[PDB]
Amino acid sequence: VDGNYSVASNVMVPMRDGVRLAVDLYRPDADGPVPVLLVRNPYDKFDVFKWSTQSTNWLEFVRDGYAVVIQDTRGLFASEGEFVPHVDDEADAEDTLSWILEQAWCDGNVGMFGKAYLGVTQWQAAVSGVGGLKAIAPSMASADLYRAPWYGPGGALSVEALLGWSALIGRQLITSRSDARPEDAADFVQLAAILNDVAGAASVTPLAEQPLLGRLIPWVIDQVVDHPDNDESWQSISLFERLGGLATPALITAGWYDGFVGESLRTFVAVKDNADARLVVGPWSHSNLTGRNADRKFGIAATYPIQEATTMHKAFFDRHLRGETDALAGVPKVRLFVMGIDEWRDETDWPLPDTAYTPFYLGGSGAANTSTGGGTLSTSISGTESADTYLYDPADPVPSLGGTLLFHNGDNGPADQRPIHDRDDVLCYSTEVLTDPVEVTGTVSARLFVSSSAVDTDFTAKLVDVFPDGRAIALCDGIVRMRYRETLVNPTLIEAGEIYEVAIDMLATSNVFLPGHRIMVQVSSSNFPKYDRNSNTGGVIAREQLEEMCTAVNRIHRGPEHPSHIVLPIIKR
Numbered sequence: 001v002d003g004n005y006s007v008a009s010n011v012m013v014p015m016r017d018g019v020r021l022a023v024d025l026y027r028p029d030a031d032g033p034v035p036v037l038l039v040r041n042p043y044d045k046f047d048v049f050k051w052s053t054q055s056t057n058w059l060e061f062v063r064d065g066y067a068v069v070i071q072d073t074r075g076l077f078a079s080e081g082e083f084v085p086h087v088d089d090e091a092d093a094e095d096t097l098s099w100i101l102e103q104a105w106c107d108g109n110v111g112m113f114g115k116a117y118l119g120v121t122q123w124q125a126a127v128s129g130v131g132g133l134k135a136i137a138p139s140m141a142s143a144d145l146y147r148a149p150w151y152g153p154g155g156a157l158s159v160e161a162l163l164g165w166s167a168l169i170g171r172q173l174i175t176s177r178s179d180a181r182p183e184d185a186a187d188f189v190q191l192a193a194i195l196n197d198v199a200g201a202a203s204v205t206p207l208a209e210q211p212l213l214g215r216l217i218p219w220v221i222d223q224v225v226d227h228p229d230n231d232e233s234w235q236s237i238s239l240f241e242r243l244g245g246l247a248t249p250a251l252i253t254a255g256w257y258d259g260f261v262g263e264s265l266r267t268f269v270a271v272k273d274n275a276d277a278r279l280v281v282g283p284w285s286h287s288n289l290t291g292r293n294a295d296r297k298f299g300i301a302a303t304y305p306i307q308e309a310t311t312m313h314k315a316f317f318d319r320h321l322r323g324e325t326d327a328l329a330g331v332p333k334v335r336l337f338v339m340g341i342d343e344w345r346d347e348t349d350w351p352l353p354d355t356a357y358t359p360f361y362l363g364g365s366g367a368a369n370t371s372t373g374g375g376t377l378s379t380s381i382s383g384t385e386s387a388d389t390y391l392y393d394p395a396d397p398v399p400s401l402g403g404t405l406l407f408h409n410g411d412n413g414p415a416d417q418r419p420i421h422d423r424d425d426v427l428c429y430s431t432e433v434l435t436d437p438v439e440v441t442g443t444v445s446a447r448l449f450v451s452s453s454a455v456d457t458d459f460t461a462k463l464v465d466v467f468p469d470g471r472a473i474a475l476c477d478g479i480v481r482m483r484y485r486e487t488l489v490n491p492t493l494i495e496a497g498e499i500y501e502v503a504i505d506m507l508a509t510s511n512v513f514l515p516g517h518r519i520m521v522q523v524s525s526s527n528f529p530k531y532d533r534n535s536n537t538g539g540v541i542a543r544e545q546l547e548e549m550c551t552a553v554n555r556i557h558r559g560p561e562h563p564s565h566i567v568l569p570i571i572k573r
Contacts, residue, residue: 003063004029009046010078013071015095022078023096025105026059026068033107035321036067036100039114040093040121042085043172044077045070054115054289055139057310064314066321067105071096073121077176084219086120086145086237093125101132109321113137113313115253116260116286120145123239123267126248135320137313139253140286142263143243143270146234146488149259149406150224153505155484155491156458156531157542159202160400161259162224163213163529164407167194167201170216187212198408199399202529205549207542225542230488243267249276251316253309255284256339256476257413259406262507265443268350278316279334279350280309281510285404288411293402296414296473298342338441339414339475340465340512352571355442359565360519362429362448362558368523371421371472375429377519377566385559390425390524392457394549397526397533398426402474403462404507408529417464417472417522427556430466430520438513442569444476444506448523449562451500454536454552455493456483460527461504461566465511466518478506479531483538493538499557506566521566525554 005028012020024045028034037058043050048070052058062068074092075083100106110132112122119141126136142148149161170191174184190212194201207225214221227233240263250271254264261281268279282305283291283298291302318327332346362368363382368375369390400408402415420426446461462477483491485502494500513519526533535541535549558564 001029002065005062013096013099015074015092019074019081021071021074021080021092021096023069023071026062026070027105028062028065028067030065033105034065034067035109035111035317036069036106037061037111037113037317038096038100038125039068039070039112039118040073040089040096040125041070041114041118042073042076042083044176045072046077051115051118053306054304055306055309056113056313057306058113060310061314061317066317069100089121089124090127093121094128094130097125097128097130097133101130108132109134111135111137111317111321113139115139116141123243126246127239127242133248135249135251135317137251137316138267140255140258140260140264142260143239143267144263145237146230148263151228151230152479152531153262153488154479154531155228155230155481155488156479156534157225157228158259158406158530159207159532160198160408160529161406162220163194163201164198166213166217166220167191170213173216187216195407199529202532205546206544207532228540228542229491240266240270243270244274246271247274249316249320251278251313252280254279254281255286256281256337256509257283257285257402257404259286259404261404262505265350265508276320276328278331280312281335282337283339283413285410285413286406288413293412293414295416295471298337298339301344302337302342336441336510338439338510338512340437340514351442351569354571356570356572358568358570359563360431360568361563361565362521362556364429368427368429369424370426371418371428373428375427377429377431377521381563382559385561387558388427388556390427390554391551392425392525392536392554393551394526394533394535395546397528398423398460398524400527400530403477403530405530414473414475417474418470421472425524425526427523428520429523430518432518434513434517434519435515437515438519439511439571439573440513440568441510441571443508444567444569445478446504446506446521446566447501448504448564449499449501449557451497451555451557452482452494452552453496453554454550455496455538456481456534457536457552457554458482458525458531458534459502459504459554460522460524461506462522462527463506463509463566464520464522465513466520468516472520475511476507476509477527478504479527480504481534499562519568523556525552
């Protein structure tokens with residue numbers, strides 16, 4: 001009977017090392033083998049409601065004759081072994097795909113889908129070289145775990161991401177225990193205390209001293225906190241350099257305020273030339289897919305469109321797993337939610353073909369400190385050589401507000417920035433009020449001429465849409481940790497007082513700045529706890545006591561000889 005299926009629970013699948021991973025099998029009631037979809041999940045295969053609303057109505061796949069396999073990753077829930085994030089998923093996926101292809105009900109075509117960690121596991125499957133894997137659909141995910149979600153292209157630790165995710169894993173571990181331990185109740189209460197105040201949890205120094213999280217999951221320190229450089233421990237789990245050699249179609253989803261957005265987009269660029277890649281980018285954060293935020297509404301069309309996503313995935317799998325050559329007719333290559341006009345729009349490529357990478361130069365009379373300073377943005381080079389100066393004190397960092405936060409207030413991406421506009425360490429530069437719309441859609445970076453009294457420090461840049469009513473809405477932002485200014489791999493310190501030209505990777509955005517709005521940039525030296533705070537010492541930042549840290553007098557240089565600017569991807573239509 002078409003539309004009918006059965007579900008077998010806890011089918012144990014043996015890995016190469018003998019450890020068995022548990023899967024559930026959703027198999028259509030049909031004669032003959034069927035195409036198969038695999039989901040590798042660290043959050044309990046049984047608990048399909050926890051993630052499915054952020055993905056697809058995938059039971060439609062099963063009713064339409066796909067088999068679906070959902071697997072507990074190694075060491076979690078019904079699976080045997082020991083859980084350490086990322087390090088076993090390449091081999092475990094290869095073995096799992098091999099097992100699936102052997103089964104009587106598999107017709108030789110496997111795909112995957114899933115979000116975040118369930119999207120990472122698809123890139124880790126895709127590098128296995130198993131021919132039966134015909135397509136993947138990694139949503140809001142990354143193929144380079146240093147660059148997202150644990151560190152970033154700027155070389156700063158995403159501390160709220162680390163601590164928030166570790167705490168959720170700890171609670172998961174405790175809730176899943178066969179026999180409760182005497183300390184479970186208290187551990188559970190204190191993991192909730194981390195999740196209720198992630199910035200406070202991230203404020204304890206030394207950062208590397210994590211008595212609770214380091215005990216429940218030592219990888220927190222042993223891998224992430226102890227490896228601030230993009231070293232072999234990170235490269236060993238990175239998939240990115242191998243993506244260019246694949247020929248695997250990929251349906252890639254991202255969100256403009258999602259923690260993985262920079263790496264999600266880079267996977268699309270890395271695979272688009274060798275197979276059928278697809279891009280969908282909505283205005284979502286990792287945990288807020290509604291399109292509604294405290295001070296910014298994108299309209300109901302911005303709500304994660306799960307039914308259209310289901311239709312698109314099925315069309316995608318029909319083309320690549322069933323060989324239905326016309327299945328993707330009418331489906332665009334790229335589909336972006338363009339903010340400002342707040343509309344979905346089809347494109348033929350990402351980056352957009354006619355992108356004009358345009359410098360907007362920092363300038364203005366007087367000091368650019370606070371939103372009532374003199375800072376300007378202009379497409380013309382500033383005529384007068386000036387400099388803006390502020391004190392970055394690690395004990396008083398600029399609080400994170402919106403952006404791509406994951407667990408610390410991570411449901412308000414397009415956050416109003418006015419609560420930090422008064423800060424002397426927040427330099428503001430903006431255009432005049434616009435009389436014509438300006439569309440900025442693409443990757444965004446800054447090039448700043450900076451100097452410090454310290455031998456290391458951070459510099460941040462944040463792009464902002466100023467509304468007529470005064471709302472200053474965050475778009476995209478980035479950081480550069482000065483020791484990593486040239487390389488994330490082999491850092492060197494800087495000379496106090498010397499001027500450096502540094503790039504700040506500000507990820508990406510799609511926004512039409514409408515008439516009556518302004519384009520604004522904030523520059524500073526902290527963004528906490530989105531990023532951990534630089535100690536301004538050149539030390540091992542995560543091993544320093546707050547007392548051991550130094551303040552830094554930092555300076556942005558701007559003028560004809562130091563033309564600091566933000567590079568905006570301008571689209572004109």
